[PDB]
Amino acid sequence: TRPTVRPRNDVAHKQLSAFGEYVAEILPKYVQQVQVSCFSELEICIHPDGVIPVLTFLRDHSNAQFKSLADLTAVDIPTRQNRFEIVYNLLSLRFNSRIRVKTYTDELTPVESSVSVYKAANWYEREIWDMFGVFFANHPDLRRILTDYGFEGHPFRKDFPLSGYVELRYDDEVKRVVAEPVELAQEFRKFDLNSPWEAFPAYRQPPE
Amino acid sequence: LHHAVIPHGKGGRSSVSGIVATVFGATGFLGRYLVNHLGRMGSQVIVPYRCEPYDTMHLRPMGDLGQIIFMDWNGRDKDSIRRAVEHSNVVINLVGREWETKNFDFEDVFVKIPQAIAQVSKEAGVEKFIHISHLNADIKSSSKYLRNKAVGEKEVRETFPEATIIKPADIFGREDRFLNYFANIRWFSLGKKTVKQPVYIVDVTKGIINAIKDPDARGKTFAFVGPNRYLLFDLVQYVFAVAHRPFLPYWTTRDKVERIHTTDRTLPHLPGLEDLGVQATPLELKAIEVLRRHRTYRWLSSEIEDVQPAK
Amino acid sequence: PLTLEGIKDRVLYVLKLYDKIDPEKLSVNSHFMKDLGLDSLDQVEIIMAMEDEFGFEIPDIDAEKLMCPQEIVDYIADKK
Amino acid sequence: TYKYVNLREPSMDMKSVTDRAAQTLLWTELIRGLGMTLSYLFREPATINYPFEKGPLSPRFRGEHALRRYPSGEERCIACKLCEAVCPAQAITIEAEPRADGSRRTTRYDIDMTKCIYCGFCQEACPVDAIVEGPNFEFSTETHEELLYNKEKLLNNGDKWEAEIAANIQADYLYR
Amino acid sequence: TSVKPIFSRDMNEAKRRVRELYRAWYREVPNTVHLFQLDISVKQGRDKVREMFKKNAHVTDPRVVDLLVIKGKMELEETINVWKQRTHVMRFFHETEAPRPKDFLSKFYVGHDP
Amino acid sequence: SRGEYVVAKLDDLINWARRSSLWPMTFGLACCAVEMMHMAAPRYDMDRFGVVFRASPRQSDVMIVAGTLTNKMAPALRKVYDQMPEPRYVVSMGSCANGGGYYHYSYSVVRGCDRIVPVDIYVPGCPPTAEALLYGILQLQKKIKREKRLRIWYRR
Numbered sequence A: 001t002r003p004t005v006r007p008r009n010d011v012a013h014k015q016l017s018a019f020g021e022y023v024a025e026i027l028p029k030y031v032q033q034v035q036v037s038c039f040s041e042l043e044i045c046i047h048p049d050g051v052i053p054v055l056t057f058l059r060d061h062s063n064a065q066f067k068s069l070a071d072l073t074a075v076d077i078p079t080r081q082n083r084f085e086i087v088y089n090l091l092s093l094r095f096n097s098r099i100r101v102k103t104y105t106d107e108l109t110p111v112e113s114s115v116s117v118y119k120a121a122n123w124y125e126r127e128i129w130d131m132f133g134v135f136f137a138n139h140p141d142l143r144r145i146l147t148d149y150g151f152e153g154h155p156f157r158k159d160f161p162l163s164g165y166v167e168l169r170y171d172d173e174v175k176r177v178v179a180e181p182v183e184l185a186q187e188f189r190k191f192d193l194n195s196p197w198e199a200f201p202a203y204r205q206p207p208e
Numbered sequence B: 001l002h003h004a005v006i007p008h009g010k011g012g013r014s015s016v017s018g019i020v021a022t023v024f025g026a027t028g029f030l031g032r033y034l035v036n037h038l039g040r041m042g043s044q045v046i047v048p049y050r051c052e053p054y055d056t057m058h059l060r061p062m063g064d065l066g067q068i069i070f071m072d073w074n075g076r077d078k079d080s081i082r083r084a085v086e087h088s089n090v091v092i093n094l095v096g097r098e099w100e101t102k103n104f105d106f107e108d109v110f111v112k113i114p115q116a117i118a119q120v121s122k123e124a125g126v127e128k129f130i131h132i133s134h135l136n137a138d139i140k141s142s143s144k145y146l147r148n149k150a151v152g153e154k155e156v157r158e159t160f161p162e163a164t165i166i167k168p169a170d171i172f173g174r175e176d177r178f179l180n181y182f183a184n185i186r187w188f189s190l191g192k193k194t195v196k197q198p199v200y201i202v203d204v205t206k207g208i209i210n211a212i213k214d215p216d217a218r219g220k221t222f223a224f225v226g227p228n229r230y231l232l233f234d235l236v237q238y239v240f241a242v243a244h245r246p247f248l249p250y251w252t253t254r255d256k257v258e259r260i261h262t263t264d265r266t267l268p269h270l271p272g273l274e275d276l277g278v279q280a281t282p283l284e285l286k287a288i289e290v291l292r293r294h295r296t297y298r299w300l301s302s303e304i305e306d307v308q309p310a311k
Numbered sequence C: 001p002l003t004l005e006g007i008k009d010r011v012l013y014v015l016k017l018y019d020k021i022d023p024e025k026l027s028v029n030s031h032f033m034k035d036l037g038l039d040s041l042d043q044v045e046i047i048m049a050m051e052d053e054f055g056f057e058i059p060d061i062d063a064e065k066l067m068c069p070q071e072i073v074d075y076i077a078d079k080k
Numbered sequence D: 001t002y003k004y005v006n007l008r009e010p011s012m013d014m015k016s017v018t019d020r021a022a023q024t025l026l027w028t029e030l031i032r033g034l035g036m037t038l039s040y041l042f043r044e045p046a047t048i049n050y051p052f053e054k055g056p057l058s059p060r061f062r063g064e065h066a067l068r069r070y071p072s073g074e075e076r077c078i079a080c081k082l083c084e085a086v087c088p089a090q091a092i093t094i095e096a097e098p099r100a101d102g103s104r105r106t107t108r109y110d111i112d113m114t115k116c117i118y119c120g121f122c123q124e125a126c127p128v129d130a131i132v133e134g135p136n137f138e139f140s141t142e143t144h145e146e147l148l149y150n151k152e153k154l155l156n157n158g159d160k161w162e163a164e165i166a167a168n169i170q171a172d173y174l175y176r
Numbered sequence E: 001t002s003v004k005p006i007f008s009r010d011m012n013e014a015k016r017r018v019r020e021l022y023r024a025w026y027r028e029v030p031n032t033v034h035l036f037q038l039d040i041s042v043k044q045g046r047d048k049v050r051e052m053f054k055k056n057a058h059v060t061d062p063r064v065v066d067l068l069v070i071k072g073k074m075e076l077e078e079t080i081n082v083w084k085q086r087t088h089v090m091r092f093f094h095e096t097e098a099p100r101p102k103d104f105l106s107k108f109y110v111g112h113d114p
Numbered sequence F: 001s002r003g004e005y006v007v008a009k010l011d012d013l014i015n016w017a018r019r020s021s022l023w024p025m026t027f028g029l030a031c032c033a034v035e036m037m038h039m040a041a042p043r044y045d046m047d048r049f050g051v052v053f054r055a056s057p058r059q060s061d062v063m064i065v066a067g068t069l070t071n072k073m074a075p076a077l078r079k080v081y082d083q084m085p086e087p088r089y090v091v092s093m094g095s096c097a098n099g100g101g102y103y104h105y106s107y108s109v110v111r112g113c114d115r116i117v118p119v120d121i122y123v124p125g126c127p128p129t130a131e132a133l134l135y136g137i138l139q140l141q142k143k144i145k146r147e148k149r150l151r152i153w154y155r156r
């Protein structure tokens, strides 16, 4: 209770509750979910056709300034009809606030390239292109950053394995570096670390 | 056979091949490319060196983790050669210096070396001994070099009779001896009519590794000749045309000039490249590879500027 | 010298100059797509090879709709 | 609370402007910088003299990956694999067999000194304190083969000193 | 299931784009093999270029063909720049064998495998 | 035996001369580079041993590969390493470089820098101490005491 347990707040909780209902009231075209965790950081869950309207509204409108940006990593999730999650993380300057904009997408449908409204978004967008492969229509510059040039395969997906397919070594047969299929000297013994006996009772989805 | 000699998986970078090699020499050229293809093939390579450890550091990163191993040896003992072939699947004899020192002649290298190692190898119970030699070894005169290699072939077919004697013709490669001798002509050239047929080094060592992994190789000596068979003066025209250095035709022993002005003949008494089943590559593209040194920024980049016929 | 025979001779010797042509067999209705066994890949190879030899801008739709060497002759005749 | 910088202005008094001019001419505080450096020049230097005067350490330092044993006793490890289960780069290869009595042991206990990262997590996880970080850090190996320790290498490494490790743990067991 | 497009509305503009990229890669190869100081004839390079185009012959979805065109145009950006190296362009070649067979018999002697 | 005697004296001269200066260059990828900078810290001097920084690849003797060698780096590493004179030496400094280490099971990471260059001296520790790195350089100097190159050349 008082020791060892982080005391939850109520002021920011009720305020972000009211603010989420405010945003849901004022943009009914592009609101699907508003949600608040116990530690009170706002999440707004979004169809990817009003990304530029929500961002132009959130940087402006003077009821919420939201100048500052943090990354949008589209965390790779199978089993959904639309796979990936673009995660904006907006951090205001006049309010000390944190909202998240989770819009969803899938493997081929482009989203509308938030570089034109946040200049910070450019290298983050090139990063998510090079690592996942969500193509960004209406964008000035799409190179590949934080990989090899000749490499492809978008390695942060769940389909790409832990060690890569290609492997570089040197040979004096052509006096240069060449690529080879992968050969590991030790198996990387995966560990089964998933306990039974219902680790959390509150988070049971309704069973089939 | 003992276990962990059996093959395992896709070859390359710690796939245990069926061979454990013992390579004589290997500090210089041909043995280095042979160790290179064995480390790609993924074997365990015992190599002796009688020299400074820098060349053995040079061929260190070729094999995988701990697949190669080093020792010391000489042409004067028997314990070191016996300790080399204590545990050897296959063993190859590459040795031979192009010039005589003040201690080791062209005599007694091809007499003292292959007799000793052949005798202790046959007494050590190895398989598939492969000794290299040159083409056109004659018992007759005009080459101390080639007659000593002829006596070497005689000794290695004499003792351990199901060996494999392999002769190529002259070989050209990424660090060739003879075209890098044609480097030194640029500061000074001799032209006579003589046919010649070089062969590129990596298909030579491809044929060597196929013949060392494949039995039927014992007994029958083999001859490795490229598809070229052309004239000396066309080679000199070709190399100074690829180098784009202007020319007016007219570390060296006279045995060198006797080698390059002897002859190059053929022998249909024995099979060769494609009869063993390995591809032969022509001269020209490997010449564009190996002539990058001499150009110096005038015509440094060129490919198809010159073609020279065979015969 | 820009008559019909100049254009036809120049297209003739540069399709001679092409290497993988199967067989030689040039005609005014040769139709190297479906009579000589050539893909759309080799179609656009040949068209921009003409463009490399002496050509114009040769826009990709007008480059794309030629298909036959005598029509290439008439095309350069229309454009040059 | 904040304290911002360069709220300053050139004062327009004559002594002020002529002192700024004299500093413009002679580079006077440049000479003050020279004087500060000479004040560290005549200061006595502080190095050590490596083969003879080694640098200091700490009692909790992380070294060797050696092994202990009981007072005149068995190998203290009991093959419980907690060290591999915390080993972050999986550099602990353990294959176990019981010995010829019924008591349980190992066969193969290999530490990859390359792939190790010297956490101390295998110090914190070993239930009997059988694997211990050593004090000394001098491996310095001319081959790649000879940084892969087998079991008998580890136990001959742990028998090169114990009174060392006993002293460090005895002075350090209450803390952790 | 009307997916938003990439560039086109059917496959005809996709065919136009991929043939335009093949035009660009045709005219850009001898510049690179003259520039990186390699050891390969030009016709070998052009033929492996068209082989790498023919590797993807079965592709039919228009978004996917557009995305291959975007990949190829990004690599031609990286080869009109000299941002890549000799190693990558030789890595497109498959010259250090890798002579791995296709017969059943050789895959049986060198086995544990189909 | 005056010939081998004089050649032995001269070989001892040049090997002493080689182990004398040994200035490296600074490749220095990650936090092992910070340990190199603390090997340039005044509490553990390298200039007691004539060991100087030299950022050009054209006059260093040894070269310290120190950091996590990736695929985007490794051809540039060897294309630095080769254009360097004939006595060349490699210090693999750190768990990342001496066998892959903590990023061993990943894409884009060279599993041990024997796959690019040869290695004379491994110095493990993540990071090494300044003391351990200095011990490795002293052992490399003792390797240069163990050369007998010119004796080999004469007795050939």
Ligand SMILES: NC(=O)C1=CN([C@@H]2O[C@H](COP(=O)(O)OP(=O)(O)OC[C@H]3O[C@@H](n4cnc5c(N)ncnc54)[C@H](OP(=O)(O)O)[C@@H]3O)[C@@H](O)[C@H]2O)C=CC1
Pocket (backbone or CB within 6 Å): B024, B025, B026, B027, B028, B029, B030, B031, B050, B051, B055, B074, B075, B093, B094, B095, B096, B097, B098, B104, B109, B132, B133, B134, B135, B167, B168, B169, B170, B171, B177, F156
């Ligand atoms: N066309 C042909 O068939 C020809 C074939 N060859 C063969 O090609 C191979 C490569 O050629 P090349 O580079 O010139 O030769 P090598 O590099 O193989 O030279 C012989 C090797 O054995 C060592 N060696 C030589 N003489 C002695 C000796 N007296 N005592 C002890 N060790 C000795 C040398 O040591 P180190 O260098 O370390 O001092 C060297 O490593 C050789 O096997 C050669 O015979 C050569 C010419 C023509």
Ligand code: SF4
Pocket (backbone or CB within 6 Å): D076, D077, D078, D079, D080, D081, D082, D083, D084, D094, D125, D126, D127, D128, D130, D131
């Ligand atoms: S944690 Fe200790 S007792 Fe357990 S297996 Fe590892 S070394 Fe042995």
Ligand code: SF4
Pocket (backbone or CB within 6 Å): D083, D086, D087, D088, D089, D090, D091, D092, D111, D115, D116, D117, D118, D119, D120, D121, D122, D123
């Ligand atoms: S200190 Fe080394 S061996 Fe021990 S758990 Fe960490 S990485 Fe593994």
Ligand code: SF4
Pocket (backbone or CB within 6 Å): F030, F031, F032, F033, F066, F067, F068, F093, F094, F095, F096, F097, F101, F102, F125, F126, F127, F128
């Ligand atoms: S070995 Fe350790 S200290 Fe060195 S680069 Fe890797 S993580 Fe950093």
